[PDB]
């Protein structure tokens, strides 16, 4: 008979998961833009002599510079309601860093016993972090200027305070304004004891609801999420039933025999995985929007992976035809040899990664970590960022000519061996499968 | 018999459309250079503390900074005839922003009822933009300093004024100088209420003729445009006649039968489209040069598309030969399979675009919008801007290691799957067509 | 018999031309480094508020700024022997810009009759450049401060002076120090009348010999040049004799018949061209080193082209073998089809270049000129600088969404059509020739 | 019989060499980070008006600037214990630059007899460097301000001093803190006599042990190194025995005959080389960690090359199979033709390198040296950094249009000839070997 009803379900599933992902992405982009702009404004307000683009190189180098930076941060905290453009409120902290009735916590962190005398080549140190904090309470509209840093024993200096604001961007998109609480941490890190103390500002936003959100004249999203859950549960149920029928037929055919073992439809397995991921992501999204969960990364990862998986199934629909079927069977045929060559080239690639790390870590910016070395080599294989690597090595040709020559040999050998042979063999293998399927 | 007369016409057509496009492009480049330099000078004159390259990051962060920026803009407007190098004239506005007899309009835009009290987690807002403007009239050779911004309710602040200048570059190329009117808008945008207010300056130029343009000792372009119109109308007429003959023969052959359906020459269809586009663009160009139409984008698009289409027809001329014919028939044969594989790879590409957007929007500069994600993935497929993507993800490895691992898996899977398989299959398909045509 | 004597000659020829090119390149690099450092020092000395990297954006925007820049340049010229680190001497000019007994010439250039009144939309201009110059003579160890610029009629302002120095770098490489004369031009260009006046400094060095160059204890190069000339003249003579024998045999074989027409050895033609280029370049080099000719570009081009041509002949030596011969005959076979496809793809490429120029000139930095458009498209075809193009177009998505959509369609169509089809067909054609030669 | 014991040994060898390389790399990265941060802090402390990123363009241009830079460096040296954040100790030098009891050495270096009079075009110079030094001793908590530079005869000015510090980062990783001695050299180089004097700061660190390193409560690395040495000596012994057996069988089979000559296993040769490299690197590492050898480059190169070689042997393990064996035999077959084509393309590549150097050295940043030209051409071949080259040439189109046209022809010819033909032939050759192995 005729029954395309099951095929109909999965297209509506693709449609609804795509719309849900688009809506969630738009909302999340708005919230992330708000957070990022608030953080940039915080850096410009609280970091003395800060300019855009100077984030990793922003550091202090003199005792006077460090004192001025700390004092400027505290004074700008005290003058925020007068100078700021953002309508921020104090919190009168009651947590761990802040005592009962203080907004800002200025804390040193230094060794308990530290005596460094480089001139006698002697020292005695007891590694144990002693923390002394000064508490500052904001006026509603004193001794932090007497701070002594103990530079020889210093490990880091941190400033902790929180700010409450109302997100007014949500007036657009017809959302109810959200109550944000930004936890701001300014770190003066001296863990390297190298004379250079980096200064960074990091924020953590805690979104909550507002007690009295009355907005003049102001469930579709929740009902759409419920609809997505329903459609994905129906898809899960039908795929599970189909797998049960498949296993029943597998036992019935095995009872006659008296990759051949498997007789399961992988498309249904992929559909089941996508349905489970979508249901989990939708529940997580309902929670996040209800403001009882923040957890933004996991939900986004689940929803994106599910959307990708459901968009893979259009290949399953295309296999029902013939020319598309042969075009996909060519890749299916070519895959095993591609993996077998991947192993043989991956052992060489790993050896080159280790050698490049161990040799060019001290002298090359792109070779500092193993993951960075892997990314650099992968981009080199595909023809990207080659002259920058060569010029970075060339900028140190006068010093360690041995290292420069080794870098030349290393880079030339790697690029030649991989680009001119490995990729050519990949192309050769896949053309072979194309010919096999046309024969 | 011998009659290459029709073939002769299209080569002269290609020649004339190419010359016309070159002339129009030269003139438009001159005008665009003038506009751009005027806008850059305006930014340097009116934006306080502005430097080249700081266009997207240029913003205010304190109330004093905003006040100084606004006051500096107004004062530089008032001192323009004394300080400027560009011989600008005032307009004494009479439009919508400006009252009868005012040159500069300084306007706030804020909510009618706005009360934000983040410290009680309460607020009441009536979303409706109230606009109060201060009018400034230029001396011919007062209370704008009393402006209060209402920062909590503020949405944006804008400055509107117009400037009249004479384009003296047209003395070169033997053109009569043009009368330019630049409408200048300086926007202080606080729509995000994030404490950071971007400052931008945009200009809109209205070109008109000058009442008494007497230039010492001072129709070729118009006559050349007329000639182009004539040649393209002749080409249109001959192509239409040829299509009529083709349809007549199609009916005559159909009356004997008693992709087979189509018997039309696609080259003639392309020629007809190019002729129509050229005639429309030439009329639009005559208007633009007569100064009764500005509309620069549409005319340029029409002329460029027509020029590209007429340059395609040289392929038609090359098909008349044999080796060129087989080289073009190879591509003709390879096209259908290329489109069929394009669909199968495009579904995966769309799924990866959606997943990349939804996951890496919050953390990656190149993944903010769907079009940007598509461009990033397309450049990744072709081997461009790979290490920058990897390093942008690496700059956030310490925070959200789950997101970093997902980004690694996502990027590696995408690049491997597309570069190593999809492009290889494209090459394999086109080599197959080459072999088929040589057999 | 055995006679490899002629083959021996060309290897010594390759050796000597390579050594000569290396020596000339080293000397020219030294001289160019000296000139460039002198020019950079001149910019830092004479351009007010100049910083490294601000060369194209360095401009004046106010009348006070222009006055200060001009006055600072003149004062720094007057204080050069006191402030400079470079031991420069004055010239007391006697040329065209400078009157008899003046070192610095400050010259305006403005229209003879210029009246611009933008506010009445009227003007009368007589295009004719009137030049008034102020002459400044340097003290040996007055009214330039009264300069009035006539800003409305101004076209450009230029400062001309010359400086004499002694090149002491040539003490290294055991050369006799050279007497340099730098002609310095500082241009304040107002040809666009846009309110922005670019400021640039250009130098032209005239190298001469020093009258009394006595250096303590201080012909190989000249003799080596003579040797190169001798070897290239012998090679020319033998190649000409071989061509004469070839033509004699061509007539003798034609007298029996009673690409077949040509029976000449192309390697000998290439050798003759290389010999002529080397002799011309060597004479030019002897002149340049004798200091009677500067003309550095022509000699370098001749020598480099000759060196490349002589390094091509190693292919001729490799053809004498068999496997190298088949590897070169594969390319020889593949060339004609490669050119025939080049024409078919070049017509499309030209059409796309014209369309891209005409549409994206006003809005894209990389599309301003036709040559720039061609370079951009060529780099796009090979997989370079794609995301930068896409992001440059994206930075203007809010304005002219029609232009943004057209740019998206244009870029995607071009990249797909060329990268996925044209390059694939190139690879397909060359694999075909490989197969033909192996069969 | 069954004896996989020898095969077992090499996997444990790969494991131990990989772990040893990882540990050594981590330690070396920590030490290099400490050195780099100390050097950056030194530049910020001692270079007047120094900013991050201005390393190659940092230079002096006036006599007052040079005096201020030198005096600021000396004064910052004198005020270091008061202003610095790094707990540095003086050394009271007793070496060659420093007299007995001086910490800082300020030394000019100028010609013995130097008279440059550019205005008479005469000069007399005796090239011989005279050095006069001023010794400064640090107070323990005078006439350097009277320094005269002799600018006309000046060659360079250098400042020498040393600083002792204690590395406290080693408290992490449970290492005993190290005693560092940084030798700091500040060079004011006037070797070009061009009016621009570059200023650079270089450091050389001498690591030693600390006399009394008492750290509260504080051999695995040494024992692991010993274990690696033992395993690599066993591997060397077995490989040598196997080679002895191979040679014995070679003589026994040669005594019957009465690439055929060689009958040796190349894998064993590679293993022997890797074992020797690992033993040498491990002894060198033991020395370096014992602090009696610094020599960091040689040990890292040896260890990295050995690790790469041992990771190649997994290919040997994969050859024991069949599909991996054919995938590796395809590359083995394709290699000879790849080398033969490499020679033919390398002669052209060398000719293009020479021509590009000789012509575009004066005008292109990427063409200054032969190695830089080679890297630029290699990156161009692989599709990287093409538009930057084209734009660098375009930035000088107005001057030397002949050079611009030559650069256009050169770049287009090179890119077309190599990318469109050489790489296509490489792909064609390797596909041929794939077909041969499948047949």
């Amino acid at each position: 008979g005729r029954k395309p009803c099951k095929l109909m379900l999965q297209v509506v599933k693709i449609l609804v998961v795509t719309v849900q992902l688009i809506l969630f992405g738009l909302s999340n982009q708005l919230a992330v833009t708000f957070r990022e702009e608030n953080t940039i404004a915080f850096r410009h307000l609280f970091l003395l002599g800060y300019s855009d683009g100077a984030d990793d190189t922003f550091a202090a180098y003199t005792r006077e510079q460090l004192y001025q930076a700390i004092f400027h941060a505290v004074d700008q905290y005290l003058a925020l309601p007068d100078v700021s453009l953002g309508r921020y409120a104090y919190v009168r902290g009651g947590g761990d860093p802040w005592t009962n009735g203080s907004g800002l916590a200025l804390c040193q962190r230094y060794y308990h016993r530290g005596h460094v005398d480089p001139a006698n080549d002697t020292f005695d140190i007891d590694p144990m972090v002693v923390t002394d904090c000064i508490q500052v309470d904001p006026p509603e509209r004193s001794s932090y200027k007497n701070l002594t840093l103990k530079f020889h024993k210093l490990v880091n200096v941190t400033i902790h305070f929180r700010l409450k604001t109302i997100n007014l961007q949500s007036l657009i998109n017809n959302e109810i304004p959200d109550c944000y609480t930004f936890s701001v941490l300014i770190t003066f890190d001296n863990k390297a004891h190298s004379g250079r103390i980096p200064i960074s500002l990091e924020t953590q936003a805690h979104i909550q609801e507002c007690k009295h959100p009355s907005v003049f004249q102001h469930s579709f999203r929740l009902l759409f999420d419920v609809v997505v859950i329903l459609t994905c549960s129906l898809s899960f149920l039908l795929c599970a039933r189909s797998l049960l029928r498949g296993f029943l037929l597998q036992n019935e055919f095995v009872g006659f025999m008296w990759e051949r073992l498997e007789f399961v439809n992988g498309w249904y397995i992929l559909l089941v995985t996508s349905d489970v991921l979508t249901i989990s992501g939708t529940i997580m999204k309902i929670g996040i929007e209800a403001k009882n969960l923040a957890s933004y990364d996991v939900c986004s990862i689940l929803l994106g992976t599910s959307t990708l998986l459901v968009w893979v199934g259009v290949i399953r629909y295309l296999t029902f035809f013939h020319n598309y079927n042969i075009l996909i069977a060519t890749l299916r045929v070519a895959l095993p040899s591609v993996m077998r060559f991947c192993c043989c080239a991956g052992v060489i690639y790993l050896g080159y990664c280790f050698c490049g790390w161990i040799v060019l870590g001290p002298y090359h910016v792109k070779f500092r970590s193993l993951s960075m070395v892997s990314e650099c080599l992968f981009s080199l294989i595909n023809g990207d960022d080659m002259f920058v690597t060569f010029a970075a090595m060339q900028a140190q040709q006068g010093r360690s000519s041995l290292v420069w020559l080794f870098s030349q040999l290393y880079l030339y050998s790697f690029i030649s061996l991989f680009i001119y042979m490995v990729l050519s063999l990949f192309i050769a293998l896949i053309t072979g499968a194309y010919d096999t399927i046309k024969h």
Side-chain angles (χ1 to χ4, degrees), chain A residues 322-381:
Chain A
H322 188 297
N323 297 178
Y324 300 75
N325 187 58
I326 73 184
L327 270 176
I328 298 157
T330 298
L331 291 197
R332 183 204 60 242
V333 160
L335 187 66
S337 207
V338 161
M339 281 333 178
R340 277 193 289 261
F341 185 50
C342 274
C343 297
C344 312
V347 291
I348 309 177
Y349 179 86
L350 219 53
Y352 263 90
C353 281
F354 285 128
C355 185
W357 182 58
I358 198 72
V359 179
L360 308 173
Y363 317 96
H364 204 298
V365 48
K366 310 174 58 170
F367 284 82
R368 304 263 143 187
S369 87
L370 272 174
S371 52
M372 218 184 322
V373 167
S374 178
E375 301 156 357
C376 180
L377 289 198
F378 200 64
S379 325
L380 275 202
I381 290 169

Side-chain angles (χ1 to χ4, degrees), chain A residues 414-429:
Chain A
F414 181 74
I415 297 164
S416 295
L417 166 73
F418 278 70
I419 299 196
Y420 297 162
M421 290 207 96
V422 166
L423 263 75
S424 280
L425 195 65
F426 267 116
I427 307 161
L429 295 152

Side-chain angles (χ1 to χ4, degrees), chain A residues 299-317:
Chain A
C299 182
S300 75
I301 285 168
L302 293 186
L303 290 191
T305 305
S306 189
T307 309
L308 163 66
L309 293 193
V310 308
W311 276 99
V312 176
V314 187
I315 283 164
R316 165 217 177 128
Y317 289 124

Side-chain angles (χ1 to χ4, degrees), chain A residues 34-35 163-168 170 176-182 205-213 291 296:
Chain A
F34 177 76
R35 262 180 245 111
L163 281 186
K164 316 165 68 65
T165 206
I166 309 271
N167 190 357
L168 299 183
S170 55
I176 295 273
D178 289 345
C179 279
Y180 279 60
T181 299
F182 295 89
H206 163 61
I207 295 75
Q208 78 240 51
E209 241 200 290
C210 298
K211 307 305 102 184
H212 308 63
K291 303 303 180 187
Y296 298 111

